[PDB]
């Protein structure tokens, strides 16, 4: 009756993390002195910040 595919509950782009998540990134990137590493690694740092998706299929009867 109302087509609103998304809920709108701060889900979709909002990265709710405690800044200790930085350790998670250091483990993936191996090196901890990331005061300077992110400046020479822009392309990888951006990829680590993008999403994954799940889809909700339904089929209806056509008339």
């Amino acid at each position: 009756f109302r087509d609103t595919a998304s809920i709108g509950f701060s889900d979709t782009h909002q990265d709710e993390k405690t800044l200790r998540f930085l350790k998670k990134q250091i483990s993936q990137f191996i090196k901890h002195l990331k005061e300077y590493y992110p400046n020479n690694e822009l392309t990888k740092k951006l990829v680590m910040k993008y999403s994954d998706v799940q889809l909700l299929p339904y089929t209806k009867g056509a008339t």
Partner: peptide, 15 residues
């Protein structure tokens, strides 16, 4: 300069 974080990827990354 020490207080550098992930939020800076958009501001200082690959100047």
């Amino acid at each position: 300069l020490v207080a550098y974080g992930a939020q800076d990827v958009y501001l200082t990354g690959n100047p």
